[PDB]
Every structure is written in structure tokens, then in C-alpha cells.
């Protein structure tokens, strides 16, 4: 029953990311962090599957995904910083001007 | 399917994958390669082996 | 059992990431999720990945998040909201996802029930693959730079984009 | 590293050399190859000069454009020569220096 | 050289270790086959030690543990 | 059976060229080579 | 020769380090019967487990 | 007259120049010397 | 084998106990500076560079010239980025 | 496994004694340099001075200021102290004298060093002091900045050895110590260790007279003591790492029977003591950089040179086929 | 009488095993390459076991004290050849590799 338990660990991390999206309408920093949780859950699936199938392709992609996660976090926090600088606040009522 | 094992040797299920691939390389009906395909998937997930052993466990529990 | 312990710690820590009132606390609980993940990876036998999750996710990424979120000095009023009204929608979505997705491997990967018999003597041992053992590090390094080097270089291009974007968006030279 | 030059689509012209070396391909450059190279280098230098006048760096801009043009022109000429020697492009000249030599 | 020496010493004594392991596994497999023959008695249609692989090639029994060789 | 076409059989022709590369060998070929 | 006063705490640190090594070295050797082997790999583990049977079942 | 620009660059930025020389040696050895040794061995 | 990690876990438990004993015995008797974000970004990039060096460094004996030059190209891209950082004043705290 | 905690305590307790006496040794050496005596009244030759200071700190009342982050304020010194302690589980003192023979020991050490920054940053924000927070930010940035050069130097040693096992790194230096052909790399490593430990000339937290308040200004009693013990344990560890990577670890200077007589633990201790003396001698010799100056040194000097040495060593080794 | 074929003994005698039982080793490895099934290799395994045990008993009869010392030192150092050279030389001097 090993594989199912590893997979449900990754599953709960992914589900927690989805819930963090659902529960944080007014907190876009935690929306970003929830997205990072989802990416960690996928990275773990690749490692677990690579071990389970006795195949190295899962690990190569796991390293490359870690690179993608790093770059995406860097740029996301940059966009956060510039949005904050322009508005002086992070509240979602000040990032809703574009609509319709 | 790639053949690179996680310990530096040929992957566990690579030979089954290859045999499946050679079969499909000349059989125009994919149903001609069903047995080798389910052999490769059985190597991947051990589903039928575990199911049969669970049958054995179930019968033992019933007769106890 | 150990998987149950790590799973419970990760569950509670992740709930704390998504539910902490203070975002700084959310970043610190995220570090706890990454430590727990590293323990899981050590159980898988992948020590390089277990150490790299500490080096990169905690040592670099989480430090970035902590630096940014600390200097923001976010007041609770701008991000606070009562979440009791989201119990039904989260209940529905989580239950659907749970039933469809926590059992996605059950039909494909049927678990082996633990019998009251020593099935650990049926372990066949092959000494041929144990003469010279490769670490997870050497197995990865055998492949990254030769047979899949294009993906390696594309990842470098991704990192270069990150550097350029960070400068062009935030730099105010003195 | 195991290498294999085998292409998906077979050559349609006599194969003079299936994997010609770097120096051999370069030595196979024809007058048309040097014409393509010189045209691309000259156009690139011209664009560098004309685009560099407004910022005031026409000289350095000429250098940058010329570097891009030298790289691209060599690449195009090497492509043509190697493709002729491998039989992917019409290569009656290469076959002449193969039957004769 | 010192490592090659060690690996060479491992290669010369591998066959006796493998032979002993093969004999031990064959005896254990006979014991499990007789256990299965006894337990699955009065089960219509059963086959003691049926190979789940159509090609019939021998594989070790699967353990259900993801990475037991590292512990 | 488009999978029969030669363009879709690259692994069947490439992999035998690396069958002796360390990292994807059957452990016994090291014992007898 | 007053500077020997400073060489006393340094000598104490050196002795502490020697203790950190040797104390853990001798405890392990006493419990396992032989000193710790550096480089214990899959092969060394397989040998120990098989030797246990080869010894106890003889 | 690019012969004293290198001199001024080495005077002003000694660490950068040293780094460039060290890495340049590290790149020059396999690009040049290694094929020379490979060619010598074959003959 | 992961067998050598168990002593580390027991070591962590004991170190935590010692720290709690030491810290518990006495209980008986609004300015954003972009340069910190930037230093974090550079650290993240070079941390990933050290990460990709570890498999390469232990594997140089088998990848030979091809792996060496693929790593060299990787470094070249990242060093072009670093030069861009230098010229834009990201490395100057004045 | 029943005997494992005995080995663990046989590592930890002498380490704490060694830290307590390293502080005394630094006070004695700085004093002797300055024509004074240093601790010499509390015990013979001041040998009981560490015991008195530790017992004083134990009896001192803990303040725990009226902050809104009381748990994090107290956990921050525990985090940094546990991290300083746990690095010694993989350090070998002689052949077979090591708690955990990790095959990934080098990367494990890098991970510990990367984790060390969190105690300092959490202390700054949890202390409810703008001065402590800006000091903690500067210290954290300096530490991560010099981690890059430390990692690149580690990669250079790895290329020479081709294995992350510390014992194998030592045993690879039987032919020659790496400090001889990689002497500039050793100098860069020793300076990067100084900057990574927040030590003079890089000791921003000690620059209170420079209007630069440290990250631990709001700490009293044993939280402050834990921060101090962590920093000095890290100094000992950095000396040990300099010894292992470049000075042959437990190996003797020359491979002769006369040198092979004395145990390798004594060799290792002697080399560690020499680097611990350098840490103090440098503290006594020079003034300190400004924050901007040391950051410039980290990103503009030590990183390029570390990257250049990685390239040069790897290229030379693959060129002449001298790889492990 | 017959020494217990522990890992120390086999590793100590590995060089003699390689020189003396070479053909049985090769045949067993060929059969294993052809078929992984343990049931289909028992004859070659018996051949290999018989050659090794015979050589072990022979080498015990020729050089007993040197073999005990070498096996004792190999066991103490978990089969590390480098920490056992003097006993290795004393062992090969009375019992040549041939
Ligand atoms: C001026 O700079 C200096 C300091 O910080 C500023 C110091 O803390 C210190 C001294 C601080 C110490 C010696 C702390 C030592 C603590 C230890 C060695 C670990 C515990 C040792 C003890 C004797 C306490 C025992 C406590 C118990 C509860 C008993 C349990 C058994 C000095 C000497 C100093 O010069």
C-alpha cells in the first residue's frame, strides 16, 4: 500500500493549494503560495512515479520543474512588488480597475 | 519505456516495453499486440499479481 | 505508520499556510511543508532530491518570499476575510476532488493486502546489480548533460529570463 | 556519445560525403556561397549603420550588425556547402570534383 | 585501482552467492506454492502458481514496497 | 496503423545503438564482458 | 613564557575534538564487535544479512 | 590603439582580469590541447 | 542505502532536547528596499547553478567532452545574465 | 540503535565544552596580542571563566519583551543552535570516527549552511525593533551572498574528488593535500567562511558603535547565549571544513612511519586549532568593512573567482584525463 | 573442518577463487544471462558451489594460520583490502595464486 500513501500525500498538498485559492479572495500573496504548493505536489508525483516504475525520466523532469518554480516565483514576486509600489497597498480593491 | 533505471541499470519494464513496440511496429491491427501490452502494464503496476494474491488472502480469511 | 505521521504533519502545516492570518507565518509554515516533503523523499531513497528541496525551496525560494513579505508590513485589515461562508463550496469541491482523485491509482495500482504470513522470504536478491552501486546523484548526472542536454539549456534560458525581468521591473538605480 | 547523421528524408542527389568535416565543408565553399555570405554581412552592416544614427552610435551599431551578419552569413554558406556535399541540395559541382578526384 | 581491486573481488565470488540465493528462493517458492495449494483448496477454477505474464517469462514476486532495497 | 510508419519507429532504431551505454545495461553483461 | 596561558584553552579544545572522535569510535566498536566501516553500500548490507543466516544456521 | 586599454582594464579591474584568465585557461585546454592529445594518441 | 540518516534524526531529537533544557531552565529561578529582493533573486539563480554542478561534478568521468561543453554553454547563458546584472548596477549597494 | 544516543552525547557535550573554551581562548589570545592578560582570576589561569559565565546567564531573568510574536522570538535561538549542532553528525575525525557516513555529506553541509539564515531573520522581525530588523536583514543578505562562493568552492573540491562523501574527500588527499594546488581557493574559502560566520572583518552584529544594531540586541539570558554558542560552534565547524577539504583531514603531513605514529584525530585537531587561531588573529589585526563594501566584495570578487576556478580545474582535469 | 563460507572468508579467498574456479563462474554467468529463473540454473550453481568449497578446503589444508589471520583482519575491517596488506602478503606467500 506504499504507492497509494505517497500519492495521497501529494494529493493533499495539491488539494490544499486548490483550497488556498478558494479561501483567499482578499489575499493574493497566499494565492501565489497556494500555486507553489500545487507545483510541489506535481514535482513529488514525478519522483514517486519514477521510483515506482524504475525509470529515470521522472527525476530529470523533477529537476527542470524546480528550475521553473524558482523562475516563476522570482518573476511573480517582482510583479507583486511593482503593483504594491504603484498602489501603496496590496488590497484587491485596488487591482480591479480593468473589467467588463 | 526509456530504459534508464534509477540505479544505473536497464529499467525493470524496458524489455516488455520493447517487445510491445516491436510487435506494434509491424502489426496493422493493434489488437494483435494486446498480450504484450498488458504484459508491459502488468510489469508497471503489478495489478493482476496483487489481485490474485488478495484473492488468496480473502479465501484464507474466509476459512479462518 | 511513518507515512501517516508525515502525511498528518504536512496536512496541518499546509492548512496553516493557507489559513494563517499573518502571511509571514504562512511562509514559515510553508518551510515546514518542504521539510516534511524532504523527509518523504528520504524515505523514497532519493537523497539528492531530499537535500535539493532544502537547498532550493527553503534556502532560496522561501527566503525570497520571507524577505518580500516582511518588508511589505501588511496590515491584517487589507487581507482579512471571514471564511465560514466558504465551508459549503469548499466542501463540495474538496469532496468531488477527494473521491475522484485520492483513489485514481486504486483501479490501476491495486494494493497488496498484508497477509498473516512472512511474504518477506519471497524476496529474490540479485547480486549482479549490487557489485557497483550508483548513487541517485550519479544516475541523474549521467543523463542531464548528454542525452537530455537541450532541456537543460532551455532551463538556463528560463533562468536568464527571470534575471532580466527582475531587473527591468524593479530596478531604480541611485 | 553515440552519434547518427541518418536523416528522416533521404537525399535526392548523389552523396559525395555523408558526414563532411568542418574544414572540408568550408573548403567546399563556392563563389555563390561567398556571394550569399557577403550579401548578408553587407546588409547587416548597412542596417546597423542606419539604425544607429539616431542614438548616436552608428559605429558600434555597425559593428554589432556586422557581427550578426558574419555569423548568419557563415551559417548560411556552411548550410549550403554541407547540404551539397551530403546530396540534399543540387551538387553537380561536388560530383565533378568526386568523379575526377 | 584500489576500487577496481574491490570490484574484481566482488565479481569472482558473485556466482556462489547467487547460487545459494537461487536455491534458497526455490525452496521458499516451493513452500509458498504448497501453502497456496492448501489455502485455495475447494476454490473452483484456481491454478497454483499461475504466471500473470502472457509471455511466460519469469519475474520475481512483487513486494508492494516502493523502495525496500535502500533500507 | 500509422504507428507502423518508419517516422513513428525512432526508438526502435535509436535505442539499440546505446544498449551498451552505462546506465541502461542488464547487470549480467558487465559480468561477462 | 607567559603566552603558554593562552595555549591552555586551545589545548582543551583540541582534546574536546579528539574526544568527539574517539568516544563515538569506541562505543560503536564495542556494540558491533568491529569498528565502523566507511562506504557501507548495498553489497556490504547484503553480505551482513546473508552472513547472519550463514553463521546462525550452522 | 587597443593595447593600453587592456593595460588600464587590468590595472583598474584586477579581479575581473584574473578571473577571465583563469577561466580562459580552463576553456582553452579542452578546446585546443585535448584534440591535440587525441590526435597524437591515434597516430 | 539511507541507513546513515537514522542517527541524524536521533541527533536532531537530542539537540532539540538540549536546546529546550537550556532555554527552559531560567524560567524556574514600513520601508521597502528593492535591493534585498534583488540579492534574493541573484542568490536563487546561483543556488540553482550550484545545484546543477553537483551531478555534473560527480559525473565528469562518464560524460567526457560532451557534458563538459553542455555545462559550459549553460554557464555561458547564466554569465551573460550576470554581466547584465553587473552593468545595470544590481551588484552595487551604494 | 540503543548505543546511538551515547555516541551522540559523546559528540555534543565535548562540542559545548570546546565552544565554551573557544570563547576563553579568543579572549586570552586577543588580550596577549594587546599586552594584557584576559580572564585569569576565575579559576587557575581563568579556566573556570566559561563555567561562571554560563551559570550567570542561566540565573539571569529572561525578559521576553512584550512582542506579538513570543513563540518565534524564543524559537529563533533554538533553531540556529540546533542547526549549528547538527552539522557535526557527518564530520569525520579519523578513519571510521564519524556518526553518519553520508554519501551526500557535502550537499548536506551546504543545506545546513543555507538553513542557518532563518534564525537571524526571525530574531529581527520577532523582536519588534526597527534597528534589530534592519540589522538582521543586512546579516541575512551577507550570509546568502557568501553562500554562493562557498558552494562554488565545494564544487571545485567535488570535481577533484568525484564523491560527496567527506571521508572519501579526505582519503582523496593521500597523494597530496588539496590546499597545495588550490591555495588561492583555500584563501577564498577561509574568507568566505569569515563572512558567512559574521566574523571580523565582516562582523556587522558587533558594529554597535557604528550605529548598526545587531539582530540579537533584544535578547537576554539563554536566548542570547544560544545565539552566541551557535556562532562559535559554526566557527569551529568552518575550521573543520577548511581542514577536511584542503589540509588532508586526519592525514599526516608526510607519508612516513615517523608521522604515522600519532593518531589521525590529533592531526585533525591540530589543523582545526590552527584555523581557529587565524579566526582570532584576524579579529585582532584589522578593521571592518561597511555593509556595502563587503556586499560588493561578495558579488564582484569572490563569486567571479570561484566560478573561474571551477571552470579551470574541471577543464584541466578533463583535458589530461586526470578525473577520479 | 570445513570453514564457514562467510563474507570474510570468500572475500579473502576471492583472488584464488577467480584464478581456480574461473570456468564454472563463466558458465553460471552465461546461464544467468540467458535465463533469470533460479529454477533453471541449479546445476551450474551446484558446479560453482562444489569448486569453491573444494578450493576453500584445499586452501585451509595448505595454509591454515596465514588464512585465519587474513580472514580475521578482513573481518575486523569489513573486507577492506587496504587495511590488511601484510596478512595478504603472508597469505599469498605460503599459498601462491598460481
Ligand atoms: C564577551 O563575549 C562573551 C559572551 O557573549 C557575549 C559569552 O556568552 C561567554 C560565555 C558563555 C558561555 C560559556 C555559555 C556556556 C554554556 C555551555 C558550555 C553549555 C552548558 C554548560 C553549563 C556549565 C551549564 C549547565 C546547565 C545546566 C542546566 C546543567 C545541565 C547538565 C564569554 C566567555 C564571552 O567572552
Swiss-Prot record, chain A:
Enzyme class: translocase
Chief location: mitochondrion
Membrane protein topology class: Multi-pass membrane protein
Transmembrane regions listed in the UniProt entry: 3-23, 28-48, 62-82
Pfam families from the UniProt entry: Oxidored_q2 (PF00420)
Keyword Repressor appears in the UniProt entry: no
Gene3D superfamilies recorded: 1.10.287.3510
A GO biological-process term: ATP synthesis coupled electron transport
InterPro entries: NADH_UbQ_OxRdtase_chain4L/K, NUOK/Mnh_C1-like
Family to which this protein belongs: Belongs to the complex I subunit 4L family.
Listed name of the protein: NADH-ubiquinone oxidoreductase chain 4L
Record organism: Arabidopsis thaliana
Origin organism lineage: Eukaryota, Viridiplantae, Streptophyta, Embryophyta, Tracheophyta
Originating gene: ND4L
Swiss-Prot record, chain B:
UniProt entry keywords in alphabetical sequence: Disulfide bond, Electron transport, Membrane, Mitochondrion, Mitochondrion inner membrane, Respiratory chain, Transport
Motif (Cx9C motif 1): 13-23
Disulfide bonds: 13-43, 23-33
Mode of membrane association: Peripheral membrane protein
Residue positions of motif Cx9C motif 2: 33-43
GO CC annotation: cytosol; mitochondrial inner membrane; mitochondrial intermembrane space; mitochondrion
Subcellular location: Mitochondrion; Mitochondrion inner membrane; Mitochondrion intermembrane space
Limits of the CHCH domain: 10-51
Family: Belongs to the complex I NDUFS5 subunit family.
Function: Accessory subunit of the mitochondrial membrane respiratory chain NADH dehydrogenase (Complex I), that is believed not to be involved in catalysis. Complex I functions in the transfer of electrons from NADH to the respiratory chain. The immediate electron acceptor for the enzyme is believed to be ubiquinone.
Oligomer status and interactors: Complex I is composed of at least 49 different subunits. This is a component of the iron-sulfur (IP) fragment of the enzyme.
Entry note about domains: Contains two C-X9-C motifs that are predicted to form a helix-coil-helix structure, permitting the formation of intramolecular disulfide bonds.
Name this protein carries in UniProt: NADH dehydrogenase [ubiquinone] iron-sulfur protein 5-B
Species per Swiss-Prot/TrEMBL record: Arabidopsis thaliana (Mouse-ear cress)
Span covered, complete protein: 2 to 65 of 83
Swiss-Prot record, chain C:
UniProt keyword Electron transport, yes or no: yes
GO annotation, cellular component aspect: mitochondrial membrane
Lineage: Eukaryota, Viridiplantae, Streptophyta, Embryophyta, Tracheophyta
GO MF, one annotated term: NADH dehydrogenase (ubiquinone) activity
Entry protein name: NADH-ubiquinone oxidoreductase chain 6
Entry EC number(s): 7.1.1.2
Residues annotated as transmembrane: 48-68, 86-106, 150-170
Keywords, ordered alphabetically: Electron transport, Membrane, Mitochondrion, NAD, Respiratory chain, Translocase, Transmembrane, Transmembrane helix, Transport, Ubiquinone
Disulphide-bridged cysteine pairs: none
Function: Core subunit of the mitochondrial membrane respiratory chain NADH dehydrogenase (Complex I) that is believed to belong to the minimal assembly required for catalysis. Complex I functions in the transfer of electrons from NADH to the respiratory chain. The immediate electron acceptor for the enzyme is believed to be ubiquinone.
Misc: A stretch of 270 kb of the mitochondrial genome is duplicated within the centromere of chromosome 2 resulting in the duplication of the gene. The expression of the duplicated gene (At2g07731) is not demonstrated. It is also probably not RNA edited and therefore differs in all the positions known to be edited.
Subunit and interaction comment: Complex I is composed of at least 49 different subunits.
Homology family: Belongs to the complex I subunit 6 family.
Membrane topology summary: Multi-pass membrane protein
Locations listed in the record: Mitochondrion membrane
Catalysed reactions listed for this entry: a ubiquinone + NADH + 5 H(+)(in) = a ubiquinol + NAD(+) + 4 H(+)(out)
From Swiss-Prot, chain K:
Organism placement in taxonomy: Eukaryota, Viridiplantae, Streptophyta, Embryophyta, Tracheophyta
Organism from which the protein derives: Arabidopsis thaliana
Motif Cx9C motif 1: positions: 21-31
GO CC terms in record: mitochondrial intermembrane space; mitochondrion; plastid
UniProtKB keywords: Acetylation, Disulfide bond, Electron transport, Mitochondrion, Repeat, Respiratory chain, Transport
Designated name of the protein: NADH dehydrogenase [ubiquinone] 1 alpha subcomplex subunit 8-B
The protein's assembly and partners: Complex I is composed of at least 49 different subunits.
Disulfide bonds: 21-51, 31-41, 63-95, 73-84
Keyword Mitochondrion: yes
Family assignment from sequence similarity: Belongs to the complex I NDUFA8 subunit family.
Sequence motif Cx9C motif 2, location on chain: 41-51
Comment on protein domains: Contains four C-X9-C motifs that are predicted to form a helix-coil-helix structure, permitting the formation of intramolecular disulfide bonds.
InterPro entries membership: CHCH, NDUFA8
Annotated compartments: Mitochondrion; Mitochondrion intermembrane space
Pfam families: CHCH
Keyword Disulfide bond tagged: yes
Function: Accessory subunit of the mitochondrial membrane respiratory chain NADH dehydrogenase (Complex I), that is believed not to be involved in catalysis. Complex I functions in the transfer of electrons from NADH to the respiratory chain. The immediate electron acceptor for the enzyme is believed to be ubiquinone.
Gene Ontology biological process terms from the UniProt entry: mitochondrial electron transport, NADH to ubiquinone
Motif Cx10C motif: where in chain: 84-95
Amino acid at each position: 500500500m506504499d504507492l497509494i500513501k505517497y500519492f495521497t500525500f501529494s494529493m493533499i498538498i495539491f488539494i490544499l493549494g486548490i483550497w488556498g485559492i478558494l479561501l483567499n479572495r482578499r489575499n493574493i500573496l497566499i494565492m501565489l503560495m497556494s500555486i507553489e504548493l500545487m507545483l510541489l505536489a506535481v514535482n513529488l508525483n514525478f519522483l514517486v512515479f519514477s521510483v515506482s516504475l524504475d525509470d529515470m525520466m521522472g527525476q530529470v523532469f523533477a529537476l527542470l520543474v524546480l528550475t521553473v518554480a524558482a523562475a516563476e516565483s522570482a518573476i511573480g514576486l517582482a510583479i507583486f512588488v511593482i503593483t504594491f509600489r504603484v498602489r501603496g497597498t496590496i488590497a484587491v480593491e485596488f487591482i480591479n480597475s480593468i473589467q467588463g | 519505456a526509456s530504459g534508464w533505471g534509477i540505479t544505473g541499470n536497464k529499467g525493470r519494464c524496458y524489455d516488455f516495453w520493447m517487445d510491445f513496440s516491436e510487435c506494434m511496429s509491424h502489426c496493422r491491427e493493434p489488437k494483435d499486440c494486446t498480450l504484450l501490452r498488458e504484459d508491459y502494464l502488468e510489469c508497471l503496476h503489478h495489478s493482476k499479481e496483487f489481485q490474485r494474491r488478495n484473492r488468496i488472502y480473502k479465501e484464507e480469511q474466509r476459512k479462518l | 505508520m511513518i507515512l501517516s505521521v508525515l502525511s498528518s504533519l504536512a496536512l496541518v502545516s499546509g492548512l496553516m499556510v493557507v489559513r494563517a492570518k499573518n502571511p509571514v507565518h504562512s511562509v514559515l509554515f510553508f518551510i515546514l511543508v518542504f521539510c516534511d516533503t524532504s523527509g518523504l523523499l528520504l524515505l523514497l531513497g532519493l537523497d539528492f532530491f531530499a537535500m535539493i528541496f532544502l537547498v532550493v525551496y527553503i534556502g532560496a525560494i522561501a527566503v525570497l518570499f520571507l524577505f518580500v513579505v516582511m518588508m511589505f508590513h501588511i496590515q491584517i485589515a487589507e487581507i482579512h476575510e471571514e471564511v465560514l461562508r466558504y465551508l459549503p463550496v469548499s466542501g463540495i469541491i474538496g469532496l468531488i476532488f477527494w473521491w475522484e482523485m485520492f483513489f485514481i491509482l486504486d483501479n490501476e495500482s491495486i494494493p497488496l493486502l498484508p497477509t498473516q504470513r512472512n511474504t518477506t522470504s519471497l524476496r529474490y536478491t540479485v547480486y549482479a546489480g549490487k557489485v557497483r552501486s550508483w548513487t541517485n546523484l550519479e544516475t541523474l548526472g549521467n543523463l542531464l548533460y548528454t542525452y537530455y542536454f537541450v532541456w537543460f539549456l532551455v532551463s538556463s534560458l528560463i533562468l536568464l529570463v527571470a534575471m532580466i525581468g527582475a531587473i527591468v521591473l524593479t530596478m531604480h538605480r541611485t | 556519445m553515440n552519434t547518427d547523421i541518418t536523416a528522416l528524408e533521404k537525399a535526392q542527389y548523389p552523396v559525395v560525403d555523408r558526414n563532411p568535416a568542418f574544414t572540408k565543408v568550408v573548403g567546399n565553399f563556392s563563389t555563390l556561397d561567398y556571394l550569399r555570405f557577403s550579401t548578408i554581412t553587407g546588409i547587416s552592416v548597412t542596417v546597423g549603420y542606419l539604425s544607429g544614427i539616431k542614438p548616436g552610435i552608428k559605429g558600434p551599431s555597425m559593428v554589432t550588425g556586422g557581427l550578426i551578419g558574419l555569423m548568419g552569413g557563415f551559417m548560411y554558406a556552411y548550410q549550403n556547402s554541407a547540404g551539397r556535399l551530403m546530396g540534399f541540395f543540387p551538387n553537380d559541382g561536388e560530383v565533378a570534383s568526386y568523379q575526377k578526384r | 585501482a584500489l576500487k577496481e581491486e574491490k570490484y574484481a573481488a566482488r565479481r569472482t565470488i558473485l556466482p556462489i552467492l547467487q547460487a545459494e540465493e537461487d536455491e534458497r528462493f526455490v525452496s521458499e517458492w516451493k513452500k509458498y506454492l504448497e501453502y497456496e495449494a492448501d489455502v485455495m483448496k475447494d476454490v473452483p477454477g484456481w491454478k497454483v502458481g499461475e504466471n500473470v505474464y502472457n509471455s511466460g517469462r519469469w519475474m520475481p514476486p512483487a513486494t508492494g514496497e516502493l523502495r525496500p532495497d535502500v533500507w | 496503423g500509422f504507428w507502423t510508419f518508419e517516422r513513428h519507429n525512432a526508438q526502435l532504431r535509436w535505442d539499440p545503438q546505446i544498449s551498451q551505454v552505462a546506465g541502461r545495461r542488464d547487470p549480467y553483461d558487465d559480468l561477462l564482458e | 613564557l607567559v603566552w603558554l596561558e593562552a595555549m591552555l584553552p586551545l589545548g582543551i579544545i583540541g582534546g574536546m575534538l579528539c574526544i568527539m572522535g574517539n568516544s563515538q569510535y569506541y562505543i560503536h566498536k564495542a556494540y558491533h564487535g568491529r569498528p565502523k566501516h566507511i562506504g557501507h553500500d548495498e553489497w556490504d548490507v547484503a553480505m551482513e544479512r546473508r552472513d547472519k543466516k550463514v553463521v546462525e544456521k550452522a | 590603439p587597443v593595447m593600453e586599454k587592456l593595460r588600464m582594464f587590468v590595472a583598474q579591474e584586477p579581479v575581473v582580469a584574473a578571473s577571465c584568465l583563469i577561466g580562459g585557461v580552463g576553456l582553452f585546454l579542452p578546446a585546443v590541447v585535448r584534440p591535440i592529445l587525441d590526435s597524437l594518441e591515434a597516430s | 542505502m539511507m541507513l546513515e540518516f537514522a542517527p541524524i534524526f536521533i541527533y536532531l531529537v537530542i539537540s532539540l532536547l538540549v536546546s529546550l533544557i537550556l532555554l527552559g531552565v531560567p524560567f524556574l529561578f514600513s520601508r521597502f528596499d528593492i535591493r534585498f529582493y534583488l540579492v534574493s533573486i541573484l542568490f536563487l539563480i546561483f543556488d540553482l547553478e550550484v545545484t546543477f554542478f553537483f551531478p555534473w561534478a560527480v559525473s565528469l568521468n562518464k560524460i567526457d567532452l560532451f557534458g563538459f561543453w553542455s555545462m559550459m554553454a549553460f554557464l555561458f547563458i547564466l554569465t551573460i545574465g550576470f554581466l547584465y546584472e553587473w552593468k545595470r548596477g544590481a551588484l552595487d549597494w551604494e | 540503535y540503543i548505543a546511538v544516543p551515547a555516541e551522540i552525547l559523546g559528540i555534543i557535550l565535548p562540542l559545548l565544552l570546546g565552544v565554551a573554551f573557544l570563547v576563553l581562548a579568543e579572549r586570552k589570545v586577543m588580550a596577549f596580542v594587546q599586552r594584557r592578560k584576559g580572564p585569569d582570576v576565575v579559576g587557575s589561569f581563568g579556566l573556570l571563566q566559561p563555567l561562571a559565565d554560563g551559570l550567570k546567564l542561566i540565573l539571569k531573568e529572561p525578559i521576553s519583551p512584550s512582542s506579538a510574536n513570543f513563540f518565534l522570538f524564543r524559537m529563533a535561538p533554538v533553531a540556529t543552535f540546533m542547526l549549528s549542532l547538527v552539522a557535526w553528525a557527518v564530520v569525520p575525525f579519523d578513519y571510521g570516527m564519524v556518526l553518519s557516513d553520508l554519501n551526500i555529506g557535502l550537499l548536506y553541509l551546504f543545506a545546513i549552511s543555507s538553513l542557518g539564515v532563518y534564525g537571524i531573520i526571525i530574531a529581527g522581525r520577532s523582536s519588534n525593533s526597527k534597528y534589530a530588523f534592519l540589522g538582521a536583514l543586512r546579516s541575512a543578505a551577507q550570509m546568502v551572498s557568501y553562500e554562493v562562493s562557498i558552494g562554488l568552492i565545494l564544487i571545485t573540491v567535488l570535481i577533484c574528488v568525484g564523491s560527496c562523501n567527506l571521508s572519501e574527500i579526505v582519503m582523496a588527499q593521500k597523494q597530496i593535500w588539496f590546499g597545495i594546488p588550490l591555495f588561492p581557493v583555500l584563501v577564498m574559502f577561509f574568507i568566505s567562511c569569515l563572512a558567512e560566520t559574521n566574523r571580523a572583518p565582516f562582523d556587522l552584529p558587533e558594529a554597535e558603535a557604528e550605529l548598526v544594531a545587531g539582530y540579537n540586541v533584544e535578547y537576554s539570558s539563554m536566548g542570547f547565549a544560544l545565539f552566541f554558542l551557535g556562532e562559535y560552534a559554526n566557527m569551529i565547524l568552518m575550521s573543520g571544513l577548511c581542514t577536511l577539504f584542503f589540509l588532508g583531514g586526519w592525514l599526516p603531513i608526510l607519508d612516513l612511519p615517523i608521522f604515522k605514529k600519532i593518531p589521525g584525530s590529533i592531526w585533525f585537531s591540530i589543523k582545526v586549532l590552527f584555523f581557529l587561531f587565524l579566526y582570532i588573529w584576524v579579529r585582532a589585526a584589522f578593521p571592518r568593512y561597511r555593509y556595502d563594501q563587503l556586499m560588493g566584495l561578495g558579488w564582484k570578487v569572490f563569486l567571479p573567482l570561484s566560478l573561474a576556478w571551477v571552470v579551470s580545474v574541471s577543464g584541466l582535469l578533463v583535458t589530461f584525463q586526470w578525473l577520479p | 573442518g570445513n570453514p564457514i563460507p562467510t563474507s570474510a572468508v570468500l572475500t579473502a579467498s576471492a583472488k584464488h577463487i577467480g584464478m581456480r574456479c574461473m570456468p564454472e563462474n563463466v558458465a553460471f554467468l552465461k546461464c544467468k544471462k540467458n535465463d533469470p529463473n533460479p529454477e533453471k540454473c541449479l546445476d551450474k550453481g551446484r558446479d560453482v558451489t562444489r569448486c569453491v568449497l573444494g578450493l576453500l578446503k584445499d586452501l585451509h589444508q595448505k595454509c591454515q594460520k596465514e588464512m585465519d589471520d587474513y580472514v580475521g583482519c578482513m573481518y575486523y575491517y569489513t573486507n577492506e583490502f587496504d587495511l590488511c596488506r601484510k596478512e595478504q602478503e603472508a597469505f599469498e606467500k605460503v599459498c601462491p595464486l598460481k
